[PDB]
Amino acid sequence: TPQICVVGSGPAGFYTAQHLLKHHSRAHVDIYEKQLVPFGLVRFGVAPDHPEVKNVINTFTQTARSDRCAFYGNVEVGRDVTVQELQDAYHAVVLSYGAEDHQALDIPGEELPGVFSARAFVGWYNGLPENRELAPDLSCDTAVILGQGNVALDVARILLTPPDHLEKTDITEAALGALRQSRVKTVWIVGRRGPLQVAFTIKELREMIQLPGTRPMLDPADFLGLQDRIKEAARPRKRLMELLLRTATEKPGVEEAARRASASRAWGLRFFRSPQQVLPSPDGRRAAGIRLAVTRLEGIGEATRAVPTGDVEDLPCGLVLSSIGYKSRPIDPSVPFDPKLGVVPNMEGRVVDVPGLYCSGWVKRGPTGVITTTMTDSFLTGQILLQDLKAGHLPSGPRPGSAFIKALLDSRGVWPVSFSDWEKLDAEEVSRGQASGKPREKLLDPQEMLRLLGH
Numbered sequence: 001t002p003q004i005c006v007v008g009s010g011p012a013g014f015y016t017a018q019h020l021l022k023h024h025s026r027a028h029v030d031i032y033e034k035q036l037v038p039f040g041l042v043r044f045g046v047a048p049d050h051p052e053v054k055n056v057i058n059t060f061t062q063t064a065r066s067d068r069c070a071f072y073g074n075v076e077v078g079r080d081v082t083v084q085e086l087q088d089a090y091h092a093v094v095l096s097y098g099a100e101d102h103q104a105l106d107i108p109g110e111e112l113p114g115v116f117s118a119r120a121f122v123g124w125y126n127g128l129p130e131n132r133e134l135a136p137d138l139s140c141d142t143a144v145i146l147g148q149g150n151v152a153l154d155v156a157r158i159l160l161t162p163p164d165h166l167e168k169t170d171i172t173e174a175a176l177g178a179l180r181q182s183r184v185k186t187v188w189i190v191g192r193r194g195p196l197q198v199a200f201t202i203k204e205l206r207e208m209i210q211l212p213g214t215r216p217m218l219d220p221a222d223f224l225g226l227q228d229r230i231k232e233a234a235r236p237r238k239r240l241m242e243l244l245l246r247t248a249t250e251k252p253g254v255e256e257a258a259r260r261a262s263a264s265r266a267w268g269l270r271f272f273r274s275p276q277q278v279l280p281s282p283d284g285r286r287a288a289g290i291r292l293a294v295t296r297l298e299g300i301g302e303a304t305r306a307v308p309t310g311d312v313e314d315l316p317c318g319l320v321l322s323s324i325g326y327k328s329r330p331i332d333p334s335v336p337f338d339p340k341l342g343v344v345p346n347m348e349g350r351v352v353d354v355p356g357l358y359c360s361g362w363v364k365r366g367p368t369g370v371i372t373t374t375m376t377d378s379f380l381t382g383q384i385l386l387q388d389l390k391a392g393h394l395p396s397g398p399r400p401g402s403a404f405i406k407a408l409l410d411s412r413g414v415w416p417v418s419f420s421d422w423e424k425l426d427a428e429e430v431s432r433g434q435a436s437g438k439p440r441e442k443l444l445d446p447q448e449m450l451r452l453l454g455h
């Protein structure tokens with residue numbers, strides 16, 4: 001009876017667990033999680049208006065209810081239980097704890113109220129306990145997001161969607177309340193490179209273009225000669241560039257021109273601009289603008305770099321959201337860590353110089369992957385682990401698994417949240433969504449959750 005442990009209950013932990021249970025008929029898998037609830041960024045990252053994306057929770061829930069899987073929420077690995085303790089208790093340990101640190105802008109003015117990481121703003125509207133009191137001031141009329149990826153689009157979309165259109169989503173009642181009173185009518189998504197370097201994907205881009213009550217603001221000048229540089233582009237990429245190109249350059253028909261004219265909100269793309277400094281309001285109490293350095297591109301293809309021209313532009317705004325990069329956090333002394341890449345050094349999932357220690361997901365490969373990428377990558381780790389297990393490369397015979405860890409946790413006063421405990425909270429959240437017509441009404445207060453989890 002192989003004993004395997006997984007650290008983190010996001011997509012990487014769950015898909016690694018699913019692979020192990022599917023391919024090994026006897027292995028037992030325990031999933032440890034620091035939050036009181038499972039699912040990671042599927043719950044706290046994926047937007048409320050993208051419920052379809054969250055459906056992977058149904059297969060995760062089937063794995064968690066299986067006889068050979070157990071969940072241990074409210075257990076912070078590296079604090080409540082050490083990695084060495086897990087290594088001593090299990091035949092293999094898989095680190096799947098994501099990339100929790102958001103990269104700071106590292107620019108003057110970043111401290112001004114009104115400046116936030118995009119992921120923290122997302123955590124706020126998604127009920128992540130640590131961002132519950134983010135209290136973003138939406139009394140300004142314009143928001144600026146730095147970085148042209150899908151997270152940027154999610155924030156822009158949430159800020160500009162007519163609030164009534166979010167009523168039947170699982171967005172928090174607290175954030176929806178704040179959104180109804182928001183004065184934000186304009187959102188700029190700024191990148192230091194050009195149109196060909198955007199990181200957004202087409203579903204999300206089209207959602208933005210077609211968002212009811214809004215109009216797109218694209219400068220045709222930024223797209224000069226694009227059709228020409230995309231003729232040898234990969235299909236998906238070319239399709240995305242053609243959609244941008246049409247939006248920027250095609251004169252709309254009568255009906256669309258009218259719809260755009262009557263739109264009270266707008267969003268746009270700004271290119272070749274790098275964040276230099278956040279400007280304060282006259283009394284220094286809040287952000288009043290962003291000073292950007294004009295850039296120009298050098299290099300060819302993927303090696304293109306933005307270099308400063310010397311010119312600067314001041315763009316007025318009351319909200320500045322940074323949406324560019326994340327790094328893993330060091331978790332424990334027994335685990336090697338690469339501070340530059342912000343990952344646990346590894347070779348195809350095997351942690352460098354640590355027999356029996358593996359990694360999957362963002363902590364394995366960096367934060368570039370989407371859920372599907374995370375899923376296949378976790379299957380790669382799962383294969384290497386199972387082959388190592390089958391080969392007799394991990395400890396022989398007995399390993400106590402949770403029997404040993406629970407004896408430690410019992411003595412430390414740590415009471416883990418089981419999957420059945422989570423089902424209790426899940427049922428409560430879903431029932432609370434019944435009156436308001438939502439999928440659920442997330443509990444935000446950790447203490448109230450502990451009561452509702454049976455603790």
Ligand SMILES: Cc1cc2nc3c(=O)[nH]c(=O)nc-3n(C[C@H](O)[C@H](O)[C@H](O)COP(=O)(O)OP(=O)(O)OC[C@H]3O[C@@H](n4cnc5c(N)ncnc54)[C@H](O)[C@@H]3O)c2cc1C
Pocket residue numbers: 007008009010011012013032033034035038039040041042044045046047050053075076077078096097098099100119122151154331360361362363369370371372374
């Ligand atoms: C804002 C945002 C929006 C996104 N939207 C989409 C989308 O629409 N579609 C899509 O496909 N992908 C989306 N993604 C990408 C998707 O979130 C990632 O691909 C995927 O969640 C990475 O999985 P993971 O398991 O590595 O990490 P995570 O999902 O972060 O999960 C890591 C888990 O480990 C837990 N953990 C951390 N530290 C510890 C510890 N010390 N002990 C125990 N447990 C710990 C965390 O609490 C968490 O539950 C989004 C990401 C972000 C940030």
